[PDB]
Amino acid sequence: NFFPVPKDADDYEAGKADCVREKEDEKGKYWLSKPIF
Amino acid sequence: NFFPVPKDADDYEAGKADCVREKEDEKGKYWLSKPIF
Amino acid sequence: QNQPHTEVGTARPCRSCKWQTPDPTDPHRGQCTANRHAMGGVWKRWLRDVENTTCSRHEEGKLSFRDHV
Amino acid sequence: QNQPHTEVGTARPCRSCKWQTPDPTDPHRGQCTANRHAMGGVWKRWLRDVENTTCSRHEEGKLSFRDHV
Amino acid sequence: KVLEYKGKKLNFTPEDPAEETIPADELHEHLQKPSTARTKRLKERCRWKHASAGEFIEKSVTAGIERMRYLTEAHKASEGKPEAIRRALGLANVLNKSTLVLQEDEFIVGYHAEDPNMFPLYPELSHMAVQDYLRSDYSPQPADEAAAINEYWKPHSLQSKCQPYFDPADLGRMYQVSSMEAPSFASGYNSIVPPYETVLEDGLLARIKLAEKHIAEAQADMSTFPWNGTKGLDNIAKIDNWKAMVIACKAVISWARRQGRLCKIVAENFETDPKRQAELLEIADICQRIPAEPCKGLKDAMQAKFFTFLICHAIERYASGYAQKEDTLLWPYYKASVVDKKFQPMSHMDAVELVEMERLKISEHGAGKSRAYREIFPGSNDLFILTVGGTNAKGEDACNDMTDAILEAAKRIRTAEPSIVFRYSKKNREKTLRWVFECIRDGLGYPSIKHDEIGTEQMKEYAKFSLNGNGATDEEAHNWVNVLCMSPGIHGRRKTQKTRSEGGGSIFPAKLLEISLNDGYDWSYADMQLGPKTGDLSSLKSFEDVWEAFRKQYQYAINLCISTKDVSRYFEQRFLQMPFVSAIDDGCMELGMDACALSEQPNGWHNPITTIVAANSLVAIKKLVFEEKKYTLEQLSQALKANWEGFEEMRVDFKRAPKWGNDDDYADGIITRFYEEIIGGEMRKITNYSGGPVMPTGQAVGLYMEVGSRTGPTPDGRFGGEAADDGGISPYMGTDKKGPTAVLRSVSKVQKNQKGNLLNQRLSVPIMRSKHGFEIWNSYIKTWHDLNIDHVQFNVVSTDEMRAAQREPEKHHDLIVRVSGYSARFVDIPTYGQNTIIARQEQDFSASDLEFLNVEI
Amino acid sequence: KVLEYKGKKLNFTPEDPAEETIPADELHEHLQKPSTARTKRLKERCRWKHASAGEFIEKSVTAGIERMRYLTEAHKASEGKPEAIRRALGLANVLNKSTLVLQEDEFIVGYHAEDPNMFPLYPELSHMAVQDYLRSDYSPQPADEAAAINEYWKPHSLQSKCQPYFDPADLGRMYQVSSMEAPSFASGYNSIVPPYETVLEDGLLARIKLAEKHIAEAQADMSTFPWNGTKGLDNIAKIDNWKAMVIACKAVISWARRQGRLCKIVAENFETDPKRQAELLEIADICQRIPAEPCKGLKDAMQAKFFTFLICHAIERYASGYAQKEDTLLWPYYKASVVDKKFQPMSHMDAVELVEMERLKISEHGAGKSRAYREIFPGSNDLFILTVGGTNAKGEDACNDMTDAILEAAKRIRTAEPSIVFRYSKKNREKTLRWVFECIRDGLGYPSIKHDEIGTEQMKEYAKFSLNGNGATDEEAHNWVNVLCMSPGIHGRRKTQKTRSEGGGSIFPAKLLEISLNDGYDWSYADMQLGPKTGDLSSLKSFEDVWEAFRKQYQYAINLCISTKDVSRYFEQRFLQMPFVSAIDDGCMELGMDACALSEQPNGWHNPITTIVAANSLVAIKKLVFEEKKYTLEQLSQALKANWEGFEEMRVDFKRAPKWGNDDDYADGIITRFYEEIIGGEMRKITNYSGGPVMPTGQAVGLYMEVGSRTGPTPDGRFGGEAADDGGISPYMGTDKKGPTAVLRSVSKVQKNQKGNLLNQRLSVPIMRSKHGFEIWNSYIKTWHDLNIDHVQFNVVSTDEMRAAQREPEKHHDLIVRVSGYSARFVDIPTYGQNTIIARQEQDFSASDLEFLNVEI
Numbered sequence A, B: 001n002f003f004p005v006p007k008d009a010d011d012y013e014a015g016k017a018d019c020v021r022e023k024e025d026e027k028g029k030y031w032l033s034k035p036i037f
Numbered sequence C, D: 001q002n003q004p005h006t007e008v009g010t011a012r013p014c015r016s017c018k019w020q021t022p023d024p025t026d027p028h029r030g031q032c033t034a035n036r037h038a039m040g041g042v043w044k045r046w047l048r049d050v051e052n053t054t055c056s057r058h059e060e061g062k063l064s065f066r067d068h069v
Numbered sequence E, F: 001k002v003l004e005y006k007g008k009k010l011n012f013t014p015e016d017p018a019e020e021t022i023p024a025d026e027l028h029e030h031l032q033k034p035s036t037a038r039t040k041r042l043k044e045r046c047r048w049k050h051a052s053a054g055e056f057i058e059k060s061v062t063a064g065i066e067r068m069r070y071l072t073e074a075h076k077a078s079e080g081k082p083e084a085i086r087r088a089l090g091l092a093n094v095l096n097k098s099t100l101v102l103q104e105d106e107f108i109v110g111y112h113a114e115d116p117n118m119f120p121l122y123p124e125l126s127h128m129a130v131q132d133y134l135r136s137d138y139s140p141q142p143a144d145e146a147a148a149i150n151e152y153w154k155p156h157s158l159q160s161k162c163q164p165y166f167d168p169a170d171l172g173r174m175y176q177v178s179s180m181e182a183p184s185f186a187s188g189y190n191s192i193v194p195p196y197e198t199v200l201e202d203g204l205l206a207r208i209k210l211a212e213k214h215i216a217e218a219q220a221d222m223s224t225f226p227w228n229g230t231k232g233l234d235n236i237a238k239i240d241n242w243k244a245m246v247i248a249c250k251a252v253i254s255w256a257r258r259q260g261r262l263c264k265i266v267a268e269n270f271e272t273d274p275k276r277q278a279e280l281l282e283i284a285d286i287c288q289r290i291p292a293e294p295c296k297g298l299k300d301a302m303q304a305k306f307f308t309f310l311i312c313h314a315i316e317r318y319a320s321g322y323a324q325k326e327d328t329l330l331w332p333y334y335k336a337s338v339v340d341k342k343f344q345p346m347s348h349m350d351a352v353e354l355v356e357m358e359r360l361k362i363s364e365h366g367a368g369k370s371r372a373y374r375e376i377f378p379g380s381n382d383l384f385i386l387t388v389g390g391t392n393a394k395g396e397d398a399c400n401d402m403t404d405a406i407l408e409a410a411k412r413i414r415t416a417e418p419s420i421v422f423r424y425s426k427k428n429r430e431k432t433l434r435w436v437f438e439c440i441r442d443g444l445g446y447p448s449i450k451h452d453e454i455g456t457e458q459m460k461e462y463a464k465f466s467l468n469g470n471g472a473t474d475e476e477a478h479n480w481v482n483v484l485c486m487s488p489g490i491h492g493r494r495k496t497q498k499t500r501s502e503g504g505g506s507i508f509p510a511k512l513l514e515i516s517l518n519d520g521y522d523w524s525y526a527d528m529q530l531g532p533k534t535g536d537l538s539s540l541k542s543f544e545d546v547w548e549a550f551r552k553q554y555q556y557a558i559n560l561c562i563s564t565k566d567v568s569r570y571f572e573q574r575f576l577q578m579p580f581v582s583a584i585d586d587g588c589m590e591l592g593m594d595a596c597a598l599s600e601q602p603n604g605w606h607n608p609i610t611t612i613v614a615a616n617s618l619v620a621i622k623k624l625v626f627e628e629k630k631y632t633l634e635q636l637s638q639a640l641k642a643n644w645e646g647f648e649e650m651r652v653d654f655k656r657a658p659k660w661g662n663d664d665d666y667a668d669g670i671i672t673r674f675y676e677e678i679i680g681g682e683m684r685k686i687t688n689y690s691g692g693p694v695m696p697t698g699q700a701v702g703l704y705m706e707v708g709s710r711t712g713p714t715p716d717g718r719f720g721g722e723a724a725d726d727g728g729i730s731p732y733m734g735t736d737k738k739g740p741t742a743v744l745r746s747v748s749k750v751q752k753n754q755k756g757n758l759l760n761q762r763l764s765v766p767i768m769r770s771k772h773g774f775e776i777w778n779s780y781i782k783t784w785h786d787l788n789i790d791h792v793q794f795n796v797v798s799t800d801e802m803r804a805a806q807r808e809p810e811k812h813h814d815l816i817v818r819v820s821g822y823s824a825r826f827v828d829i830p831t832y833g834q835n836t837i838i839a840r841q842e843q844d845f846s847a848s849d850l851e852f853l854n855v856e857i
């Protein structure tokens, strides 16, 4: 899942986005957010 | 021309030698000594 | 021969032995925990080299944390 | 147009001109020695860029040391 | 059960009548009460990352590679730039590119690796530690990249920088962790007291604006006619440091806000419940403002604190610990939220819940520390020690409703970490003392108790040695916390301890004693020369000769212990700059100095561990070999080399010789001198980087187990490889035969040349859980305080329950016990360690004990 | 021809009657007389490497790549190691792997690149300078490797380290070399005074053994109980420096001996003449012993000195210069060889021959310096300035038979380099003065003459500012030499100047004046803001306003000039350590400090060049614009912007205004104030790295030509691009109309706030070469000395001969002339520069001149 970085964000650079995915294991549910281009 | 480095020299290492060649140009004669293995 | 001794290129290195756990600082070294006393002591021996040392008590495997110090 | 002026991708850059000699510090810069006075002065002009500057006095070549400062 | 005292019959029946019939061996499985459904859920699914015996308990816990990868990328790209700026760029790259994590039910958010089951590694510190990870089941992956990374860093590592300045034979000796703890530069282990106060009060945007101002002024200074080259060059290092601070702070803000944005994204795209959606947006907003801006409420403060913790303890650099004065730190924000309701309005119980969540996040904080330090804190993630209570600048009670919220949260949620230290003063309100006791009587092992006045006085004394005459003021000296388990240090916006190189690290008297009797040669563990050749057995013709041999062994060892720390300090400030920590220290910011370079408050210490084994051994040697001449030293030494096999009658003689902790004159006279003249006296001759003395902080953590296993048989009666004493000044397990107040009387005799000393005691469960529990305990503490004892901490746990937990660990998950300076999940401790805790004497109180304590019922 | 003086008729016929009829335009082609067949051969085949106009004169001269290649290889391999050790490792790799060179007929052997037509480059210094070489016809080869090397070094270069601490606009202004010389960190240009005395007396083996001893003691110190971290950490930097010294010294010895081995190999395998074979083995033995061992004779000393020169000036780092007190340095060895015949027995003429060979080797020393510095020393390889004469520690004559040998060799062999400075005292023996005059009367341009007492007093004054109170003692203050052309510095085993960052670098009043009249804007050369906006033309309502505008221009410029040097100093000692130079400085060795870090004798200076153009311009402005109000400033400025075209009558007015050098009150009153209050007075307000003042050393080298070409028309009457004044305090060429003693009278008026000032004068050939020449010259010098003038140097050359050499350069190869602070081969000077020398007034002496000088015939 691909979410473009808000252009007014401190970490905005052209083409930058957050790649967000949901995971779940024995313990529970969580989300990971990694910056990509 | 290949001259093995004297084994008691400060710069002796196994297989090391001075490669010595004579050159001459418009100015005059000279010799170059480059260490090789 | 039931004490650690050098044996170059041994098929049974300390490294694979269940009694061994790596040295706390340098993973090239090891700790032999084989000498276990009836009163509970675990009388370790320091291993200079875990690739080329062995003894007759060698047993391949891994102890759980419960059985180590 | 007989004074140095920008001309992007010119066929006749300062760099190839006999009147030019490189800046003393930064070889990206240049010195124009074309303005030579009758009383012997060599009234240099500083060149910000020798790849994209030119003027009408451009002449390909190289002066010997004798004719430079 | 029943005791007669001052013409009354005391009945030790439990306060909760239900406990009359609950089996003794399962008591603690009944005590948790998480304040909310959420925190109950959070505990049940808690991602514990406990380590024991050098390994992680759970197969799922494994190393991350992102921090390694991005630090390396930045380092290659920043070649040539000033080192402080290179460090800031490194941190920034890590923060900019890191995968961030959000978990279900969380309110306090954030993490320090790319996955909630992971932890980061530190190739810039110890190349050996990384290599050990590569050889483990929990190696970072891909292994080939990680290996390539470690090879890149090795020539640049802190370890590689420091080693050339010491005799290699000496390093080899230290690295064994038998007589000396390995130097921090070789393991990467470390600690810190973050200036949390600065972040919460000012926010990072203000720090940035401030550094920028310093830079502009400095650049202006350098272009002012007439230049003075003996002054103007000072601006270079300052400008480098300030520019580094700005880079670091901007990256932290960006990282915090990106965490916030993940909350927003999950709320809008992943979370289906409108309740959680609203909460996630609430969290997202906090993360947007904080820590960029000053905190306004308790929720702000908690998230600010957690973010700061992550940078200072995990991301910028590894540091053990959780040092902070949490009640005093959070009070202004508690007050704003709970009392005045001015921002982020909350109930007291809301505050209690927030602290529970904090405890659970810390419980999930896995530590990328080296093998040794996965050995010596069994049953825990790491050391996390926070401080509460004590006194304020005017010497009045510092306890408050935030203190109580912190204590109740601990009692309710029952996590082994973080541990708590309570600074005890006669000023402290009873209402808060009762909460302290609620935690202790439930067997949590904490709060441990520190003597408030001793610590405050200590801060004043060290302050006098300040190299720039800006040590703690008399009022500031009241602002102190334990750095890790045991040693006091200043907290606040300035003058806090920035590195373990200042103070920390251990030395092991028991091993030093053993090799004292073998001319410095360790025959039993390493089979090599471990110390100086202080004299063969025949040269030891009197007890004084034995005493002097140990002294020289100790002098040789302690010199290496401190010098290796000071050399590390030299290079840390030169190549391991911490620009974020610098930016939030008022002194660093003002002076344009790195956190490791500037040292305004000296705090030098080292940890004697296994002291009482050494001490009891010496007592026994004196009595049986030299006074009574029942055995010669050759007879003793032959017996020792045999592990007492064939010599059981001799062993039993030495075992029954007088022992520490019995208020016995013979033992205590020798051992008091041992603490004061040698352990403290010799160490105190050394001056560290900061220009103050180095004094001993006696403790043990799990080293009393590990060093024990590396120590041969000793004249106190140990077989080879048996555990050492459990504390800095505890009686050896099972040798205190005169009751709890006899112990206090022994311990109180050590008064000179100490920085601190850890005392473990174990109290009878029925008494402590009875209605008389608080009065007896409060009387115990008052008496302990009057005797001027530095420290005490309590186990309150039946042997029955611990044995049951050994047989059936899966039925005893919530059993928590005190080890030494920290608490642990009992079933996560190896059997060897478990048995040492069971062997600790459970103390009952006689009527004479109670009279001594001046108990009133 | 004929002059009447005190009732005698003086006849100015040449001393050698043959010269009566030798045409004037070929005189100097008759004067050489090499002392032996060998040195005649050596001169005829001399591999001159002169540079002019930014290029080398000969197509055969080209850059080497070996130094670049091997420095790079070492730097990559030494990552992580201490910087001082890395530097030592770099030098060692270069020395270990370098191709060495032996040439026919040589006795003094050695070289600094891989081929006798080559020179090394310096990627560690200025990346721009290397890039300039890559764009030239004499690029190192292969070009692709060289380009790759420069890209590797760029982030690590000295240039890249220093630039971030300055406004980019300021650097751009300096880098133009119009109002300010570019900082050394941007060009790589540099200088040094090697402690030759230490090498010759002690040898390198002793230095090694000494450093090793310091290291062992330091390591012992660090393991001594009880450690003190406020002291013991000091050993780290010390041990690093000493270990680096050992690495460097061992490499130098190995390199010297390998040079020796090449001599042996050629003797045994290549050379067919038994005479040369024996000599080659003699040389081989010297190289084996030297510089490992103390020198025993003159042949030892000369070779030791040359080896030391190569390391210090070419191989470890680039440094211009040849600073040394050669007669005092070599005297003990001359005495041993020539007088006592105790070792390497020799005749005086043998000594003379050996000095000739030294002069020829230096004549072959090509310099890998940047474009600017291939511009400003036209007709020479580089600056090479040695010092002789003066006084000893007791203030008595230091002249001796070695002095005379050095002077005679110069007279005989007629090489433009090295140049000589003679320190003149009334103590100096006439026998040696006569040799000094023999060189001068032959038109060599040297020895230049320095005032002995002024320089010695100067050393005492600077010594007072020593940061560790170990400046020159009163006796040591007599031990001084010129560093490059003009500025005094201590020579000896200790306290010598190690870097040009201490003192050196230039500033250009003429350009500052020009932009003063245009609100800091340089319209004529760069078309940009060059200085501060000190006020537009209309704001300059009085002469005082003009005066103040220059002051501010000067203050802005000089602050940058010194601060850029001090910043360079900061990084040089941190990343450009010179462990060999450190090893041979007694202070560095003793204190375990790098040569650039330790500064025991302050010697701060900067060079005003084009001063008199500025000064004459100010005089003319005052008289014509403000006093007489003949022209307004707008009228002047309009004229200037027109290059005087259409305004010739105005130009001639300004040209004829009073000029420096005519003993004219109006000019000299203004100009004296200008030197003392502004040039010196303002500069002296600045304190450098070493904690002493910065004072001006007026000179010019070839910058008076280059800056002239970058300076627009000025109110002294110059057209745009014409040359500036040729000295620090010389009359502008062709403006001194009152004779030679009028000049002395003007110059003598400047007495305050100067470090030195270069005076060029040109004397009539017939008078100087007549039998009355010496008496008149000796009287001139006595008078010059009494007037307390700092410096003077002489051209003695007919215009006819110079013009002939312009028409037919191939017929005038041995024509040598004085430029400014150095001498050059006239035909290797560009026409522009040649004309400025021809334009210098050839001075005749009137009978009143001779009376003023108190001449007795």
Ligand SMILES: O=C(O)/C=C/C(=O)O
Pocket (backbone or CB within 6 Å): E191, E482, E483, E484, E485, E486, E487, E488, E500, E503, E504, E505, E506, E607, E697, E699
């Ligand atoms: O740093 C240490 O090892 C000690 C910490 C403490 O007990 O405070």
Ligand SMILES: O=C(O)/C=C/C(=O)O
Pocket (backbone or CB within 6 Å): F191, F482, F483, F484, F485, F486, F487, F488, F500, F503, F504, F505, F506, F607, F697, F699
């Ligand atoms: O280094 C310089 O700029 C000049 C030195 C000198 O004239 O001695």
Ligand code: SF4
Pocket (backbone or CB within 6 Å): C003, C004, C005, C012, C013, C014, C015, C017, C018, C019, C020, C031, C032, C033, C034, C053, C054, C055, C056, C057, C058, C059
């Ligand atoms: S092989 Fe032998 S010495 Fe090695 S770890 Fe196993 S039991 Fe110990």
Ligand code: SF4
Pocket (backbone or CB within 6 Å): D003, D004, D005, D012, D013, D014, D015, D017, D018, D019, D020, D031, D032, D033, D034, D053, D054, D055, D056, D057, D058, D059
């Ligand atoms: S092209 Fe024109 S401006 Fe450029 S160097 Fe030649 S003459 Fe000068």
